[PDB]
Ligand binder design. Structure first.
Ligand SMILES: O=[N+]([O-])c1ccc(O[C@@H]2O[C@H](CO)[C@@H](O)[C@H](O)[C@H]2F)c([N+](=O)[O-])c1
Ligand SMILES: O=[N+]([O-])c1ccc(O[C@@H]2O[C@H](CO)[C@@H](O)[C@H](O)[C@H]2F)c([N+](=O)[O-])c1
Ligand SMILES: O=[N+]([O-])c1ccc(O[C@@H]2O[C@H](CO)[C@@H](O)[C@H](O)[C@H]2F)c([N+](=O)[O-])c1
Ligand SMILES: O=[N+]([O-])c1ccc(O[C@@H]2O[C@H](CO)[C@@H](O)[C@H](O)[C@H]2F)c([N+](=O)[O-])c1
Ligand SMILES: *[C@H]1O[C@H](CO)[C@@H](O)[C@H](O)[C@H]1F
Ligand SMILES: *[C@H]1O[C@H](CO)[C@@H](O)[C@H](O)[C@H]1F
Ligand SMILES: *[C@H]1O[C@H](CO)[C@@H](O)[C@H](O)[C@H]1F
Ligand SMILES: *[C@H]1O[C@H](CO)[C@@H](O)[C@H](O)[C@H]1F
Lengths: 447, 447, 447, 447
């Protein structure tokens, strides 16, 4: 079947600062909560860390030349907060800003639109020492960081994202303790979540006041769960799983309130959102679009012992990627329609890809399973567009294999293989497949 | 996850006469429309035919010993009509009956409940020469065939199925011309479909009048399609695809009428159901259960040029089995719930399996993909049962690799590999996996 | 180096009833706590169970012919209690006794001395329903079981073992809940341990009173731990680890009391040994020898959170077998000397071997790692003998690959490979290596 | 398990001049006893010699860049005596000194602390012609060589070692005749041993008098043997084996006398230490630390025919490296504690590694066995430190595969593979494993 995409559909790739840059102590860069987390025994597989990574701090010219020959139109990357404000102290580090100027100018020189993610989990450790995100003072610090970026890169960046995956920053990091700072306290996670939102709203307001060019939004990772049974409890368990990922952040932004159920659910566990007068009005600041990050879908059932959401995921026996996630692309189509509850808003698939660990053999990386995964999901994207939904673009998660957080370098997601012993780049077969798709602007599934 | 099945869940395997028996001219067996079809150049891949097949006419003792060590509780097989009535002439062939007596006695001797399919596509050619199924006289002939079986095997067979997949017998065979007798005429397909139903109702009535022991039903192959778009036309295209497979045969049986839409749809193409007074009352004869045959699910859209149903199947990019069918087990769960429109009737999964062509290597057949397929579908079965649906059993399509109709022996579906050069049987890894599942009565999915 | 063994050193192999026999419902056999445990979802890997196993209930003639060509002088096997007393009810099952008569007569016919283990974990479920081992009534039942065996096989069996690994029966099964009946209660484990001892003493007394021919003892699995540091706490942690395995059962038998430390240790956790007047005198019944079961050694340190013994095992980085146990043969030499605290008693290495999962390739099983493991341990045995210690024999754990309890059939320990799909036996290379060693009565290590 | 090392633990790598340098006749270098020994038929496997070797005389910049990216903090190398004093004649060769200036400056430029071994077996042949080490005149010559180095590299080298493995220089070379000069005379070996000690003491005294910066010590290869039996004779055999390697050199240095037993032992064979007035006082010169070289451990027994020490090593069947040495890391922990008899002195593991001959395949050297070996020994190092012992650093024996003395290039010990046909360097997998360990400063053992 032939799937033809819109004339101005935006094709791209994505990365994150700490996962590819390296040079963690270079040019005055301060430490982030992830440097600390990764340097702690038992937090990251094999003791891997973001020192060096893909050394993209030095090899960005090569990476850009590679994405250029891919035919891509945009590149999503994030800004290392501690490279700009080593202590989130207000004392700017020009060397840090200069790095992004080099990357951005080279991007614009190659006709590639920068898609800037301001916050991709690397909160300066100095700020964490005072409570990081748990402390409202951090809100003011982010706004200064954001404003600095808006003033410095005005006209050079037309697409901005305040936060990448609030659910991970708040709950995965402060409730489940899997990501930095690795805490396990419901109240703290809720505090972090609320403060991210306020910080987001204020940043958007400054963006507007400053007259910065471009559009600005936020990029939540979206979840999707379907009930194992037709029971009301299973249905409720799925509602919680889905809502905590998107609705808990999007309802405040689009409708001015936290999902009541869940608020009640958390109250039962003794937790309450630290809402202060004016907060909700701030969070309700209008945004131009949102980024959606999708990887998988699940079948859940109510289970009193299954985590703080009492929602158990059933292993349905579907094949999984090398990181253990089942592939079921329909979830992307289902959640895109679900999200229409906020209106037919502009949506970019900022994140989508698969962990496939195939290595270089005979000079190539035969990652057929990655091609298969991307094909299936791009079909759902076309399907959504065909339903009249405003899905504006797609960004393959990761141009390069990189530091996959707590998994270390063991889990590869790139379309370009990186041998971390030499830093040599080897485009995978998925890279050439993707180059053809973006170049033609249409896709074909064949037996 | 652990999936525990009901105490009396019935585990089994299935085959069909023409696909495994062989000895096509032995002991007075007459020719069937499939012998004719297969002996015709261009009808079956490579010119393969049912002569010999798995030679189960002679090797049934071995097959039964193999299903016995599998721990199975029932065996679904079909009766070769032309072995009983070489010409559907009324002149019984005792040698034919004796074969099934040997098979059935051996089954009962091994504590394996026979699950008898009366009609599995092998209509005697003599009857086809007069119009086969298109001629109402064939209705009377089937009833005699059926009655003969009820009288001869009373008490030895407690589970009976009149027809296996009416949609294939009628439409696939008489409209699409893919299966014997290979015709391409809408009206003839509709005539065949209607006559099968009348023949089914009369057989059930005789079953009741004779006081034959056991339960009796019919086994349609069920289809499931989901709309590509949210459009009303795509929705209608899916309704036609789904209904023609099940509803067109089940609504008459359970509710006394053909689905009105479709009737109108066919009328537009100039075709009408040849309904005679009393027909619908006959077809409405009460049945004890139904067999459901499921293999795949599809995503469709309306397309004026896509066949007589104008329903186009979209290639979503999902991986497929070796015969080309996508695996998406949710379809089984969806259609089981769909079927509740007829009430919470007793349902047996009479057919489910996958074409996986792995051969014997190092003494074994590592058919992991078949195990994966079966695991996924058994989960949906447990899921349906958990929803309170009366799914009573499951029969893995084919104990043995066999004659896969128009595909010939090229497409293997067995849990037991058969080398057609020697007739040697080699249990596949799926066989040992299945033996463990049925033996334990529960299933476990693991990463 | 050449290691020459004593003229009358006894070479053998070992198995256990539930792990090899199969025919779990045949000839009136009752259910054991292990049938129940294995038939419970989540208790044994893959849902494996002892139904069938190595089908040694039917294939013992072949197994014996194979051990015969091995040149072995004894065969250690266990008696299925529920085959003799289906309900531990007192109602003897002659068919059960007849099975062991066939095995024993064939052994004696082949010049192979039976080495009978009375209790190898298969307590009749009927007895467990009343408290099994936790109920003193079980003590009386075992004595009847034991007495029945002494009377029935007098003169045919000259070597008897009451219990195999009391530590597993009590603590692993009732405190850690890893083995049947899978309980997690300190007090219950201590009760079981004490009752096994009383049952052991009474059985030995009856053995003496009846004048049964042969020698009788008990076979504990011995542990060995060395301190990570020179600290007194690490030293204490190792003392607990070592003593609970052997001393907690041997001190009562040889010296008339439970190790005081440990008694105090358990008292701190609120547990006390249910000692009744006369118990200790009973347990102190004189025995002829003991069987020692050894597999591995460990380096431990004190850790308040490391189990009920607060003894943490350090992963020193040594290579491990396929079941995960490090190989360090010196432990056998160290514990044999440690055990001299009870005098220079007759000791048989009733258990020693390694989990090596090599399969049949090119008609053979190249299990070099098993040969390496056995060579290393036989050297320590020679070493102990050379020190004047009375180590009388050695029995390779398992003639055959079998049901490895909670690991199922996944973990192979045999010197003879068993394909569970066919029950075909294939002697591994270790088998031929062992045949040469036992035949020559000496061993040689070479570079 | 996680093993975290001290904040200032010193990680490094080690090599030796004659084993890596090459350019044996370049820039006025004189011949050493090893050039002579290697150029003699039958002395070194395949007639291999140190001409060329790793050509590190020319390729040191590359080697240093490679150790730099390893994250190492020190580099142990030795000085070719004949490059400095071609004839040990007193006539300095500035070109020789300039080479080490280039190496040392590059090391300091890269933040790598030089760890200088003055004597690593390459005695100038001119000196051997007069008796080499057997002639006291050689003592004066070494002191001049040493002094020259102290004066020339003052402030550039803060870590010095006078002699590397006195046992090899004396006994292996002059009694067993395995290493240059290849003599077999007990008295001569004892003379060499004593003269090395005097030369060592005088060098240390000059070091002190000159005010040279840094610390100075000696690096003996330590042996460890455990008795096969509990007999007093086996115990004595092990004492001799252990003491001749370390105590015979360390007791004189730390306590002012040769181990009395052994002195008596050698007297029985007619040999006496040529001690002159003042010698012992000289040898007793205080040192700052010692280097310990460890590779293996053994189990020995007394045997009148087993060499001049009548100590036979038993082949216990443990797996060995490719050069034939068993791996048993506990020996390192045992000897470190044994050495405390001299007080809790500063100890550096100057040598530790394994001969693993894996070659380059698919662009890499999968030397997993080397990683396994290093992991096991680093654990014992952490273990010793945890016991309060002052183990200050660890140096992996050999950055590069090199000339392994009498074994030639056949036995590879490097973490970096060197193809001697091209001199191409290929970092082995152990290199990347080590880079991660040193970088993190902690180690983790995993199943
Ligand atoms: O420059 N300033 O003086 C300044 C002060 C507070 C600012 O912001 C304020 O910060 C507080 C924490 O310190 C939060 O509690 C308030 O919600 C936030 F509006 C900002 N800003 O966000 O642009 C700027
Ligand atoms: O034995 N008989 O005389 C006899 C006759 C017609 C019989 O059946 C009749 O057959 C006709 C075709 O010949 C159909 O049109 C009728 O619908 C059917 F009732 C049956 N029967 O089905 O049991 C038996
Ligand atoms: O045959 N009998 O009447 C009989 C009774 C109690 C017997 O044994 C007794 O059993 C009690 C539990 O019922 C335990 O509490 C006693 O410790 C035990 F001596 C025995 N015996 O062990 O030989 C035999
Ligand atoms: O420069 N010198 O005249 C000189 C002389 C003898 C020296 O050293 C002397 O050498 C003798 C052999 O020739 C040895 O027997 C003595 O033990 C040693 F002290 C030294 N020195 O070691 O520094 C220097
Ligand atoms: C989107 O998910 C991927 C996969 O876990 C992460 O690597 C990114 O950081 C996240 F934003
Ligand atoms: C069920 O479907 C299978 C696969 O096409 C066929 O072989 C059977 O005959 C049918 F009843
Ligand atoms: C000795 O240990 C082995 C290995 O776990 C078990 O299979 C035996 O039953 C036990 F007695
Ligand atoms: C330490 O031992 C290694 C291995 O034999 C040698 O290559 C070194 O020269 C020695 F110092």
């Amino acid at each position: 079947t032939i799937f033809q995409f819109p004339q101005d559909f935006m094709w791209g790739t994505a990365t994150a600062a700490y996962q590819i840059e390296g040079a963690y102590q270079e040019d005055g860069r301060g430490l982030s909560i992830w440097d600390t987390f990764a340097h702690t025994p038992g937090k990251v597989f094999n003791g891997d860390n973001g020192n060096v990574a893909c050394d993209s701090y030095h090899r960005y010219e090569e990476d850009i030349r590679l994405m250029k020959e891919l035919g891509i139109r945009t590149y999503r990357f994030s800004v290392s907060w501690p490279r700009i404000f080593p202590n989130g102290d207000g004392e700017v580090n020009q060397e840090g800003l200069d790095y992004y100027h080099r990357v951005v100018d080279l991007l614009n020189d190659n006709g590639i639109e920068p898609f800037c993610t301001l916050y991709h989990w690397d909160l300066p450790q100095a700020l964490q020492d005072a409570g990081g995100w748990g402390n409202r003072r951090t809100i003011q610090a982010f706004v200064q960081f954001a404003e600095t970026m808006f003033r410095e890169f005005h006209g050079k960046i037309q697409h901005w994202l305040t936060f990448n995956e609030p659910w991970c920053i708040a709950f995965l990091s402060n409730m489940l303790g899997v990501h930095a700072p690795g805490l396990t306290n419901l109240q703290t996670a809720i505090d972090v979540g609320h403060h991210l939102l306020v910080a987001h709203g204020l940043s958007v307001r400054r963006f507007r006041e400053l007259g910065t060019s471009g559009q600005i939004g936020i990029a939540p990772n979206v979840s999707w769960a379907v009930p194992y049974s037709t029971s009301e409890e299973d249905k409720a368990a799925c509602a919680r799983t889905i809502s905590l990922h998107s609705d808990w952040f999007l309802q405040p932004i689009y409708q001015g309130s936290y999902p009541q159920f869940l608020v009640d659910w958390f109250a039962e566990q003794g937790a309450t959102v630290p809402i202060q007068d004016g907060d909700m009005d701030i969070i309700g600041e209008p945004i131009d679009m949102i980024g959606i990050n999708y990887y998988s879908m699940s079948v859940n059932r109510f289970n009193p012992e299954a985590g703080f959401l009492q929602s158990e995921e059933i292993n349905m026996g579907l094949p999984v990627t090398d990181i253990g996630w089942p592939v079921e692309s329909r979830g992307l189509y289902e959640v895109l329609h679900y999200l229409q509850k906020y209106g037919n808003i502009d949506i970019y698939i900022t994140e989508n890809g698969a962990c496939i660990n195939d290595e270089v053999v005979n000079g190539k990386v035969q990652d057929d399973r990655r091609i298969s995964y991307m094909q299936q999901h791009l079909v759902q994207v076309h399907r959504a567009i065909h339903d009249g939904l405003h899905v504006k673009g797609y960004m393959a998660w990761s141009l390069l294999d990189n530091f996959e957080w707590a998994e270390g370098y063991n889990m590869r997601f790139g379309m370009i293989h990186v041998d971390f012993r030499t830093q040599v780049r080897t485009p995978k077969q998925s890279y050439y497949w993707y180059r053809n798709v973006v170049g033609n602007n249409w896709l074909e599934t064949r037996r």
